[PDB]
């Protein structure tokens, strides 16, 4: 029962003299220490070996069969493996022995979330709140809400969360991103800027804020904010895609596709970078690469109408107009809230001399009205012509 030596060899990240003292103290007491096996298990856990911390903490539970901490540690070592059902059924008995510790509630909530049992997980995390609330409870609750239903409870629970302990970056950035995915924008910028105040150069908030600024023009400020972190993460497909779109905003097409190709070499299976490569090659009038990247992104994202519209815009300029027809047919069947597809199909039909279903496409478009500076003139010119 002199365990202070094992304790100080553990807490000092020694882990090689500590095991020797464990051997000596199991040679002095033959076990029955309840704090040498505990610390050997914690050694094996903080080293990453949990298949043995499991057995050691199970011995500890064998030594003190009425103690919440040993069952806690065995079920934690069960959860840190893949096994969640057993972890839950050990947390059950650990709760039977004591219903006053919050950690049992929180970890039960997590394990239930893994098995898609969101109802009982919600209840367990409710009790975890009502006992002694911690931020992780809020984060896991938000995960339940987002994977389960709508954001009209996630934003409220994350607001409740950030209310206290507001200097926490994870909660702030998650709430900002939830606002962004929601309708509101100004609040998203508010919370992400708060994150940037607390954490000056974090990747998540900087990326999201740059996306916001890009969507509202402001390509230079977004480019500087990317430069803030462009060395902390030198090879990340999202950063280079956003930088390529920053340059494409300010008519620097060559640097735009250089950034987009560097991003696409690092993520050949992402459809946003491919959509961007195809769009920019439509703008530079390549029509032999635009079609390539657009068809690739179509393969990776087949349920999108803008991709088929742009594949058709590329095919129309490739002396291949029947594939343009059928692509536009897929595009109009898939697209609901973007009249540019209908406008481009109407222009194709008109220039094909058809002019009869060109009015059908114009009618489909006007049923969807949204005004780009160039989306209006060609629209009204096709209009007066029909």
């Amino acid at each position: 029962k002199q365990n202070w030596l094992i304790h100080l060899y553990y807490i000092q990240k020694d882990y090689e003299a500590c095991k020797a003292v464990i051997k000596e103290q199991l040679q002095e007491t033959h076990g029955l220490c309840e704090y040498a096996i505990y610390v050997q298990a914690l050694i094996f856990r903080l080293e990453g070996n949990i298949q043995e911390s499991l057995r050691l903490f199970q011995m500890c539970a064998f030594l003190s069969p009425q103690c919440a901490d040993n069952l806690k540690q065995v079920a934690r070592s069960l959860f840190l493996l893949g096994k969640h059902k057993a972890a839950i059924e050990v947390y059950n008995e650990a709760a039977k022995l004591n219903q006053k510790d919050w950690e049992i509630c929180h970890n039960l909530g997590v394990c239930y979330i893994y098995l898609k049992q969101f109802d009982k997980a919600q209840d367990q995390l409710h009790n975890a709140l009502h006992l002694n609330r911690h931020d992780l409870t809020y984060i896991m609750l938000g995960k339940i809400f987002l994977l389960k239903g709508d954001l009209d409870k996630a934003i409220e629970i994350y607001k409740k969360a950030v209310e206290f302990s507001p200097e926490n970056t994870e909660l702030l950035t998650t709430l900002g991103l939830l606002y962004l995915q929601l309708g509101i924008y100004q609040k998203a910028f508010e919370h992400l800027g708060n994150t940037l105040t607390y954490d000056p150069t974090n990747y998540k908030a900087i990326l999201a804020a740059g996306s916001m600024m890009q969507t509202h023009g402001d390509f230079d400020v977004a480019l500087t904010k990317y430069k803030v972190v462009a060395c902390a993460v030198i090879e990340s497909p999202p950063l280079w895609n956003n930088i390529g779109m920053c340059f494409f905003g300010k008519k620097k097409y060559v640097a735009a596709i250089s950034c987009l190709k560097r991003a696409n070499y690092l993520a050949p299976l992402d459809w946003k970078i491919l959509y961007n490569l195809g769009l920019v090659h439509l703008t530079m009038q390549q029509y032999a690469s635009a079609f390539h990247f657009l068809s690739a992104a179509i393969n990776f994202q087949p349920k999108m109408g803008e991709l088929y519209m742009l594949l058709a815009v590329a095919l129309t300029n490739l002396e291949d107009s029947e594939n343009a027809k059928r692509a536009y047919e897929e595009a109009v069947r898939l697209d609901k809230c973007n009249p540019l597809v209908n406008l481009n199909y109407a222009v194709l039909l008109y220039n094909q001399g058809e002019k009869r279903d060109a009015l059908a496409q114009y009618q489909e478009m006007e049923k969807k009205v949204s005004s780009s500076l160039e989306f209006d003139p060609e629209m009204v010119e096709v209009a007066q012509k029909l």
């Binding site: 499991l54 199970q58 069960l78 493996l81 096994k83 059902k85 057993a86 972890a87 059924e89 050990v90």
Partner: protein
């Protein structure tokens, strides 16, 4: 289940002896290599230098290496004979379990595949690991119902064990849960 476990324990003792002898031989070979490299560096130098201490250390280390090699050969042969006797033991045990619970031909083939895995022990795969993994899987997906047991006791791993306690626990549990109406399947 009691004159059977004695052959399993004999086999595992031979395996553990072989692993100990292999570690001893590892150490002897490393020492021989160090001394031989010292002698080599001595041979490269142009100037004379007394070294009889070194070569009389080398001779001792080499005779110990020869001893340990012969001992590992002996243990390999003993282990092979123990494995061949254990094969017959487990043959008879499967026969008796099939007569004792009226096992069909397929339920006998599952036993013959789980309990009679391989032809001889190798330095990466042996008998106890394989039969214990197979029995754990069969108990886990055919007989057991509780999940805490399926995750804590019933675990399948393929490294040399520390003792035959789990293998014997699982063989007895397999016998008794066959006695309680359980039947064997695959998926």
């Amino acid at each position: 289940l009691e004159e059977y476990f004695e052959l399993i324990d004999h086999h595992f003792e031979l395996r553990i002896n072989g692993e100990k002898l292999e570690e001893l031989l590892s150490e002897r070979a490393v020492q021989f290599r160090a001394i031989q490299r010292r002698l080599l560096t001595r041979f490269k130098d142009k100037t004379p230098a007394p070294l009889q201490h070194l070569d009389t250390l080398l001779d001792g280390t080499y005779k110990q290496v020869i001893a340990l090699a012969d001992a590992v050969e002996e243990n390999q042969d003993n282990l092979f004979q123990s494995f061949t006797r254990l094969k017959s033991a487990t043959h008879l045990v499967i026969l008796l379990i099939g007569l004792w619970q009226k096992l069909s031909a397929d339920q006998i083939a599952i036993l013959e595949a789980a309990f009679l895995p391989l032809q001889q022990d190798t330095q990466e795969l042996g008998w106890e690991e394989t039969v214990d993994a197979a029995l754990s899987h069969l108990l886990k997906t055919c007989l057991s119902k509780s999940s805490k047991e399926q995750a804590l006791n019933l675990n399948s791993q393929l490294g040399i064990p520390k003792d035959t306690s789990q293998l014997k626990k699982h063989i007895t549990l397999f016998c008794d849960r066959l006695a309680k109406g359980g039947r064997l399947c695959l998926s």
